[PDB]
């Protein structure tokens, strides 16, 4: 996570932040799995910078994403 944080923070120039894999990280079910933690932490990293969440024209409708 630290490596990725510095990677994103340093190259804020040509990095198309990819969703539709962060999404599946926190789009889990089965409330007995610490598996959406990775997606939450990745979104927290991307939000630690000034990077907009969900960058609309990259996939899923905002409704399902944020739900």
PDB file of C-alpha atoms in Angstrom:
ATOM      1  CA  UNK A   1       0.000   0.000   0.000  1.00  0.00           C
ATOM      2  CA  UNK A   2       2.850   2.391   0.794  1.00  0.00           C
ATOM      3  CA  UNK A   3       4.506   1.665  -2.554  1.00  0.00           C
ATOM      4  CA  UNK A   4       1.277   2.323  -4.445  1.00  0.00           C
ATOM      5  CA  UNK A   5       0.595   5.490  -2.465  1.00  0.00           C
ATOM      6  CA  UNK A   6       3.939   7.025  -3.429  1.00  0.00           C
ATOM      7  CA  UNK A   7       3.576   5.738  -6.986  1.00  0.00           C
ATOM      8  CA  UNK A   8       0.244   7.513  -7.398  1.00  0.00           C
ATOM      9  CA  UNK A   9       1.354  10.626  -5.476  1.00  0.00           C
ATOM     10  CA  UNK A  10       4.459  10.996  -7.656  1.00  0.00           C
ATOM     11  CA  UNK A  11       3.025  10.315 -11.123  1.00  0.00           C
ATOM     12  CA  UNK A  12      -0.126  12.475 -10.934  1.00  0.00           C
ATOM     13  CA  UNK A  13       0.324  13.263 -14.602  1.00  0.00           C
ATOM     14  CA  UNK A  14      -0.561  10.311 -16.841  1.00  0.00           C
ATOM     15  CA  UNK A  15      -2.055   7.782 -14.434  1.00  0.00           C
ATOM     16  CA  UNK A  16      -5.547   6.777 -15.463  1.00  0.00           C
ATOM     17  CA  UNK A  17      -6.688   5.544 -12.064  1.00  0.00           C
ATOM     18  CA  UNK A  18      -8.320   2.194 -12.772  1.00  0.00           C
ATOM     19  CA  UNK A  19     -11.646   1.354 -11.229  1.00  0.00           C
ATOM     20  CA  UNK A  20     -13.588  -1.807 -12.111  1.00  0.00           C
ATOM     21  CA  UNK A  21     -10.923  -3.577 -10.111  1.00  0.00           C
ATOM     22  CA  UNK A  22     -11.066  -1.428  -7.007  1.00  0.00           C
ATOM     23  CA  UNK A  23     -14.812  -1.946  -7.333  1.00  0.00           C
ATOM     24  CA  UNK A  24     -14.596  -5.749  -7.182  1.00  0.00           C
ATOM     25  CA  UNK A  25     -12.301  -5.330  -4.197  1.00  0.00           C
ATOM     26  CA  UNK A  26     -15.068  -3.697  -2.145  1.00  0.00           C
ATOM     27  CA  UNK A  27     -18.033  -5.165  -4.054  1.00  0.00           C
ATOM     28  CA  UNK A  28     -17.969  -8.354  -2.019  1.00  0.00           C
ATOM     29  CA  UNK A  29     -20.628 -10.047   0.065  1.00  0.00           C
ATOM     30  CA  UNK A  30     -20.577 -12.570   2.907  1.00  0.00           C
ATOM     31  CA  UNK A  31     -20.147 -10.382   6.002  1.00  0.00           C
ATOM     32  CA  UNK A  32     -17.505 -12.751   7.339  1.00  0.00           C
ATOM     33  CA  UNK A  33     -14.604 -11.753   5.087  1.00  0.00           C
ATOM     34  CA  UNK A  34     -12.018  -9.037   5.580  1.00  0.00           C
ATOM     35  CA  UNK A  35     -11.899  -8.863   1.786  1.00  0.00           C
ATOM     36  CA  UNK A  36     -13.378  -5.455   1.023  1.00  0.00           C
ATOM     37  CA  UNK A  37     -10.717  -3.955   3.283  1.00  0.00           C
ATOM     38  CA  UNK A  38      -8.304  -3.953   0.356  1.00  0.00           C
ATOM     39  CA  UNK A  39     -10.696  -1.999  -1.847  1.00  0.00           C
ATOM     40  CA  UNK A  40     -11.499   0.463   0.914  1.00  0.00           C
ATOM     41  CA  UNK A  41      -7.805   1.039   1.568  1.00  0.00           C
ATOM     42  CA  UNK A  42      -7.054   1.471  -2.134  1.00  0.00           C
ATOM     43  CA  UNK A  43      -9.833   4.035  -2.447  1.00  0.00           C
ATOM     44  CA  UNK A  44      -8.444   5.740   0.638  1.00  0.00           C
ATOM     45  CA  UNK A  45      -5.062   5.913  -1.073  1.00  0.00           C
ATOM     46  CA  UNK A  46      -6.477   7.383  -4.268  1.00  0.00           C
ATOM     47  CA  UNK A  47      -8.440   9.854  -2.154  1.00  0.00           C
ATOM     48  CA  UNK A  48      -5.401  10.769  -0.059  1.00  0.00           C
ATOM     49  CA  UNK A  49      -4.380  12.739  -3.143  1.00  0.00           C
ATOM     50  CA  UNK A  50      -6.668  15.198  -4.929  1.00  0.00           C
ATOM     51  CA  UNK A  51      -7.789  12.438  -7.309  1.00  0.00           C
ATOM     52  CA  UNK A  52     -11.527  12.477  -8.042  1.00  0.00           C
ATOM     53  CA  UNK A  53     -13.417   9.323  -7.097  1.00  0.00           C
ATOM     54  CA  UNK A  54     -14.937   7.110  -9.762  1.00  0.00           C
ATOM     55  CA  UNK A  55     -13.894   9.241 -12.807  1.00  0.00           C
ATOM     56  CA  UNK A  56     -17.252   8.682 -14.501  1.00  0.00           C
ATOM     57  CA  UNK A  57     -16.341   7.610 -18.027  1.00  0.00           C
ATOM     58  CA  UNK A  58     -14.501   4.495 -16.859  1.00  0.00           C
ATOM     59  CA  UNK A  59     -17.250   1.938 -16.414  1.00  0.00           C
ATOM     60  CA  UNK A  60     -20.042   1.199 -13.944  1.00  0.00           C
ATOM     61  CA  UNK A  61     -22.796   3.729 -13.286  1.00  0.00           C
ATOM     62  CA  UNK A  62     -22.113   5.898 -10.241  1.00  0.00           C
ATOM     63  CA  UNK A  63     -25.242   4.567  -8.542  1.00  0.00           C
ATOM     64  CA  UNK A  64     -24.050   0.962  -8.345  1.00  0.00           C
ATOM     65  CA  UNK A  65     -20.456   1.985  -7.624  1.00  0.00           C
ATOM     66  CA  UNK A  66     -21.313   4.162  -4.640  1.00  0.00           C
ATOM     67  CA  UNK A  67     -24.050   1.809  -3.440  1.00  0.00           C
TER      68      UNK A  67
END
